[PDB]
């Protein structure tokens, strides 16, 4: 399989990001339940929270208050930012190669 590395890694980052979103949702709820006042405690809204966290939006409607909930959050942020950054890098590599040919 000799397809462009930048597109492979971009695909890998996307799949991995989806995994992080699902795992993040699960682990956040597991971490936040048991803490009085915590709102990140049911899976559907936890997945929504993971999405806005990975994109860095966030709104402030949901967020973790525990140590482990916040650690999970940081992993989600980094994975999200890295993934989108890897797509941008792949796009640049594409454009650069095509401009040489042009």
């Amino acid at each position: 399989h000799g397809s462009a590395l930048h597109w492979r890694a971009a695909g890998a980052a996307t799949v991995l990001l989806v995994i992080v979103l699902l795992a993040g949702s699960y682990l956040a709820v597991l971490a936040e339940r048991g803490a009085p006042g915590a709102q990140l405690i049911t899976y559907p809204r936890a997945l929504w929270w993971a999405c806005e966290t990975a994109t860095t939006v966030x709104y402030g409607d949901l967020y973790p208050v525990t140590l482990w909930g916040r650690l999970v959050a940081v992993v989600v942020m980094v994975a999200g930012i890295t993934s989108f950054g890897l797509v941008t890098a792949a796009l640049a590599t594409w454009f650069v190669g095509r401009e040489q040919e042009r």
Epitope: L30, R33, G34, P36, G37, Q39, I41, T42, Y43, P44
Partner: antibody, heavy 118, light 108 residues
């Protein structure tokens, strides 16, 4: 078919301890929580605690004194509640309930009537 | 923790009328309220989830409404099998809590 099976009754001597059971049936997911609810005669529902079988973590009501200890067994799909050092205050019906991690109690057990007496 | 207040504790109504149970939270909880029915010597049974969402198997005369702090469970044309205790439950913040309950009465 009956999703949550609980024994009908348990007789406990004052100061002793009992281990209640809740046997699960039907669809079981990784995101399932088993809750325990205490109801004294002629009174309302009181939330005791919760456990997630797929991970084993348990949380408890902090407003009340901790009398309970939640464990689970994935093999037998059974959740357990360990009530210890019981008095007459602890005499009640104890329901187990299943929550799909979306906030509500979809199904309840028939409840185990716990009587504490000598 | 979130306090849910159900007042009054007893509702008396003539057979066929529309009844409304009240549930008030000590703080805003969106629509994260669920309703349960418990008959004499029975286990609680889910009637309405997320304030207004209906459940399969539950008679269409049962409905729910409200958001924020004030929630209502309604029965269109009360009949004898509706005689029970009615509880609300919130899942907005940990820990989940229950209301104190409202008993339904029928003046036959």
């Amino acid at each position: 078919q009956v999703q949550l099976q609980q024994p009908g009754a348990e007789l406990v001597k004052p100061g002793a301890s009992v281990k209640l059971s809740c046997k699960a049936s039907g669809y079981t997911f990784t995101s399932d929580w088993i809750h325990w609810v205490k109801q004294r005669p002629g009174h309302g529902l009181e939330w005791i605690g919760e456990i997630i079988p797929s991970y084993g973590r348990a949380n408890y009501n902090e407003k009340i004194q901790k009398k309970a200890t939640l464990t689970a067994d994935k093999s037998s799909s059974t959740a357990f509640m360990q009530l210890s050092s019981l008095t007459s205050e602890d005499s009640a019906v104890y329901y187990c309930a299943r929550e799909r991690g979306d906030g509500y109690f979809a199904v309840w057990g028939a409840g185990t009537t716990v009587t504490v007496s000598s | 923790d979130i306090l849910l207040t159900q007042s009054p504790a007893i509702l008396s109504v003539s057979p066929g009328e529309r009844v409304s149970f009240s549930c008030r939270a000590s703080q805003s909880i969106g629509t994260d309220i669920h309703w349960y029915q418990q008959r004499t010597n029975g286990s609680p049974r889910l009637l309405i989830k997320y304030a207004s969402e209906s459940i399969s198997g539950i008679p269409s005369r049962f409905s729910g409404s409200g958001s924020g702090t004030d929630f209502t469970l309604s029965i269109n044309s009360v009949e004898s099998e509706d005689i029970a205790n009615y509880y609300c439950q919130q899942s907005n913040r940990w820990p989940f809590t229950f209301g104190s309950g409202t008993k339904l009465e029928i003046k036959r």
